[PDB]
Design a protein around this ligand. Structure first.
Ligand code: CA
Ligand code: CA
Ligand code: CA
Ligand code: CA
Ligand code: CA
Ligand code: CL
Ligand code: CL
Ligand code: CL
Ligand code: CL
Ligand code: K
Lengths: 98, 102, 100, 109, 68, 84, 105, 98
């Protein structure tokens, strides 16, 4: 026939995060659909706010700084702190691992 | 006469391409089903005027979402409304839906 | 003794617990599917639907009505009634900005 | 040449930094994308995902179930002050609502 | 203005404001409050009262989705 | 004084009456002036937090009208006439 | 010739075209798009000014002020809906008192 | 001196449309400020929806057809009809003029 066209998804990453957090826990196909909607939603939100931040400040480049500000505006209190913590770790580790 | 010279886009004037062309189905939103939805919403007692009032509201909700879904359909030159048309429609209406795409 | 008879309100409460516990769709699927198709005809004739499109619409509809019933209920109780009424729904939709 | 390892691995992340960098470029957000932005964003999406799965898992354990379903995500989200706010205007298919009965509607013991 | 500066201090110290910044905040607040009073009044009348009360404001804000 | 370190009290009962009047309100519970003050403050907290986040991002020490216009837009309270 | 003149427009087709390209909307912008968009902004701007100018005339004023815009918009079912979530600085509100609050007659 | 940035605005075009519809009526600076906020709001709404249309349909180009669909989605019934009418007319007249 033809092999069905490629449909990207986050579901291998969601499964990998689930196995860190709950090693003996799995996830229904629907549940994973919701997880996929979630990730794409918050991507849109952070990215769109970052788009605006750069635009407001006459900048052509979305940097880790715009992401961070976008996250501060978008995530509630405790969630925003952790997120800013995990992003800052990940950049720092990345940069030193060139 | 009618009203309008050019109605070739609408495609209206359609019958006997197999059975089709619908009925009056809002009554198929039964009083029991409306009471079930109100139960999920924590409602304990329901005036008899609620059922017809709800069908009114459900209808306006569906006209608005479907009008925008079908707009996405027509734009994509399709004849089939996809789940993504509805998901884009609902996000527009500030009624963001998870678990059918995007 | 008589044949058993629950007081008005008791079965209602039971149903509330039952349906708040479950996640299955509460409008019969075929009637809903016809209704959808019927409304779509007013915008374009001879439209096909993916079944997931009709399912997406029903999830969105029921979620909207369950939510509006939460708000309608608060409006009834605000007026020291236990019986939801059209003017409860109307107030809820007006304050929501759905309606002028 | 090569002995290549993914940007995800360099940043200590499960989520795809490279995929995230390509979606930022093609998503029409800015002309240019700095090299930190997709690492940071991939981190944030991983953290948030971990948080929802931690709380869904607890709701799944609580119902004597091995697999998370839409209801577990809904309970997790709606019972968490902050996730409920982040997703205040989001409908979770097949999630239902929280058991909540207004006090005044309960019979008088 | 003093209220605006006071509240700003909790987020950052030694902040200056454009006068139009303070006027834009006042325009926004007054519009928000006037509109909340329109909704508060309806809730009062719904309960067969002519007197707005805190629970009217709370129900208006609960239905608007401003408060849980 | 308590009013200078609790400036929310400078939003006077007369000022809250005038606002409720413009909202077509006729009669007012005495408990509303405190409840309004609580609500006003949450509103300004939310708007000013976002406005000052734009200020910090731009590396400025001065909050502009635009910082406020972007914050009001973010919160779904779009404002016309201050540089939209 | 000017692109605005060719399209029959007061609004600036060239400006709008530049704003679409630079505004991070799409990789490429077709030549019709800024003409269509400018025409619509001009149509809507004209509707509001027509109505606001009448509100000014009715108040024996030669200049439109934010209240003339607010009255134009809020007394127009469709404009009111387009701008249902917009605050007009110095616009005020439409005269409107709930019936139950008026004295008996 | 000679700063004040050079800040663009729609106010000459607003005045130009005003003189067509009401040649003897003028406009306060606040009122002009609201007109300028209005144009930027609706611009951003239409273009944003157009951006999404082309993105959903894997198209690189916003054409007059994306603007037209954006307008149908964004404007209420009667307003949309006239807006489509004026946009269609303007494109038609602009092609016929070369
Ligand atoms: Ca663990
Ligand atoms: Ca003309
Ligand atoms: Ca005209
Ligand atoms: Ca009109
Ligand atoms: Ca209309
Ligand atoms: Cl009633
Ligand atoms: Cl960067
Ligand atoms: Cl009270
Ligand atoms: Cl084009
Ligand atoms: K964009």
């Amino acid at each position: 026939k033809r092999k069905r066209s490629r449909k990207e998804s986050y579901s291998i990453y969601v499964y990998k995060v689930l196995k860190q957090v709950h090693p003996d826990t799995g996830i229904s196909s629907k549940a994973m659909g919701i997880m996929n909607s979630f990730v794409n939603d918050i991507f849109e939100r952070i990215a769109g706010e970052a788009s605006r931040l750069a635009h407001y400040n006459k900048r052509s480049t979305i940097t880790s700084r715009e992401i961070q500000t976008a996250v501060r505006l978008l995530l509630p209190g405790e969630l925003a702190k952790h997120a800013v913590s995990e992003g800052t770790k990940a950049v720092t580790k990345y940069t030193s691992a060139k | 006469s009618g009203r309008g010279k050019g109605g070739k886009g609408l495609g209206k004037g359609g019958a006997k391409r197999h059975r089709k062309v619908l009925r009056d189905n809002i009554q198929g939103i039964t009083k029991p089903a409306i009471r079930r939805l109100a139960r999920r919403g924590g409602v304990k007692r329901i005036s008899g005027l609620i059922y017809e009032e709800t069908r009114g509201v459900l209808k306006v909700f569906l006209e608005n979402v479907i009008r925008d879904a079908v707009t996405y359909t027509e734009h994509a030159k399709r004849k089939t409304v996809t789940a993504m048309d509805v998901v884009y429609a609902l996000k527009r209406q500030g009624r963001t839906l998870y678990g059918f795409g995007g | 003794k008589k044949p058993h008879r629950y007081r008005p309100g008791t079965v209602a409460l039971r149903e509330i617990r039952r349906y708040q516990k479950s996640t299955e769709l509460l409008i019969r699927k075929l009637p809903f599917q016809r209704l959808v198709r019927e409304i779509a005809q007013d915008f374009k004739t001879d439209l096909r639907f993916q079944s997931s499109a009709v399912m997406a619409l029903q999830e969105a509809c029921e979620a909207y009505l369950v939510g509006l019933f939460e708000d309608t209920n608060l409006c009834a109780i605000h007026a020291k009634r236990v019986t939801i009424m059209p003017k409860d729904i109307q107030l809820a939709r007006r304050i929501r900005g759905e309606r002028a | 040449r090569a002995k290549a390892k993914t940007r995800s691995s360099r940043a200590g992340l499960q989520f795809p930094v490279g995929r995230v960098h390509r979606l930022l470029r093609k998503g029409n957000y800015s002309e240019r994308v700095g090299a930190g932005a997709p690492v940071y964003l991939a981190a944030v999406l991983e953290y948030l995902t971990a948080e929802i799965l931690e709380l869904a898992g607890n709701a799944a354990r609580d119902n004597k179930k091995t697999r998370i379903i839409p209801r577990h995500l809904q309970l997790a989200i709606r019972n968490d002050e902050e996730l409920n706010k982040l997703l205040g205007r989001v409908t979770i298919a097949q999630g239902g609502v929280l058991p909540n009965i207004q006090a005044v509607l309960l019979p008088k013991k």
